[model samples]
Target: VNSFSGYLKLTDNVYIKNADIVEEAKKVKPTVVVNAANVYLKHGGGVAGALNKATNNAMQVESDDYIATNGPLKVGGSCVLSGHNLAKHCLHVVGPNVNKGEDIQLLKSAYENFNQHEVLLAPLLSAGIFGADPIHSLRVCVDTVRTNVYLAVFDKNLYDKLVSSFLE
Candidate 1:
């Protein structure tokens, strides 16, 4: 049956599951978006890359300036930038290169860096281009982000798999 069993309602606002993140972000109108950025503020691939293209590379340029002013962010560290075509604000963090036990801590640290925001959209850290296990990353994200969290998943097959797992 067509159902939303995959969605885990963590709170009145928080939720965990898979959906088109950008589209959901548009509907939610999040105050902030957590972007998975690299250490040097590079938006070369994954969600950040897409957003970079949408903003005409403005995310890259703005992140570059933030880095120049604040210095290179650590793997778990983050920086905020103007959303441009994305949201009102963007929280950029350097997620782990791969899925490891430490990756959970990294995501938690990134979430901790965020300021109070009504809504926040985040991708599965290191789960896409970086090739981390989506299930593991989802657990980490759900466990770490205590505020309004929207986990964006774009792959239909993967989304189905995630949903199936919940049923099984």
Candidate 2:
């Protein structure tokens, strides 16, 4: 509810019910947040919560949108960054299988995908695709995104890289 349902009132006059709500939100100059952690989206939760929330006009919905990887495959610093670049409000999750262990090219590809589009829905950050973290997997993800010396949250290197680079 923090910011999920804030746009309903403005959209009522547009009569664009149940269709491209995300896109419509962007059209009216609404901010699309990546890694919102609460709002329902494909990458955040998925269709069920997204449709349910929008159907009943609920404020926020929760689901498996944030599940990128699970079980022994899960690891720390698993946040994904590339998918949100060009999309108004979206999340791009990078799996471990893309290029075998947090490859920069995959990150670049994910960013390119976002740049190819103007808007994107949230995606999932999954692990165990190729294999579980190998102790230094976090470093792989970090180095891939760390193009500058400003230094990010360390854990948030992936997020910062995509957001900062894409916005620019």
Candidate 3:
């Protein structure tokens, strides 16, 4: 969602924007999109909610089926599911609560464990409902990506602040 001056490019492989990823992932079809999933892998709200809407709730339906077959993920845990939409697949990773002080390392793991897709679109995990610092979350997000990673951020100010913070 490059609604704001295209995308804020940090490096050749990193692109950031204050936009929803559902449509963006649709644009970059056949790629892997990430969901900052809960330990239980529910798409109640936040990033998961957005993707669920785009996927016609198919991803969530599969998520519940996945949990029913497997088990709930722990902090820093992850699993892959059918895209059920435009993306080839969705990587549902559980981030730390950050409320536990909380676990910055866990946040890093959630990002690092992205299954190494050639092209990946991920949100700033744990910086939303889990309450991690946006700057710190942004750092981990950028640092952990080994290949192409698109960051679809929701907060306009967060998007503005990070663009300035990094451009400087």
lDDT of each: 0.69, 0.29, 0.78
What does candidate 3 score on TM?
0.89
Which segments of model 2 are wrong by more than 4 Å?
Answer: 1-88, 98-130, 147-168
Cα lDDT over the full model 2:
0.29
Candidate 1 per-residue lDDT, tens place, 46-142, comes to 7888767767888888888888888888887887788776678888877777633345457667656643555677776766666666666666665
Clashing pairs in 3: none
Predicted structure with the largest TM-score when compared to the true one: 3
Which numbered prediction scores highest in lDDT against the true structure?
3
Better of 1 and 3 by lDDT: 3
* Model 1 pairs whose backbones collide: none
Give the 10-residue window scoring lowest on summed lDDT in candidate 3: 1-10
Show where candidate 3 strays beyond 4 Å.
1-5
TM-score of each: 0.80, 0.24, 0.89
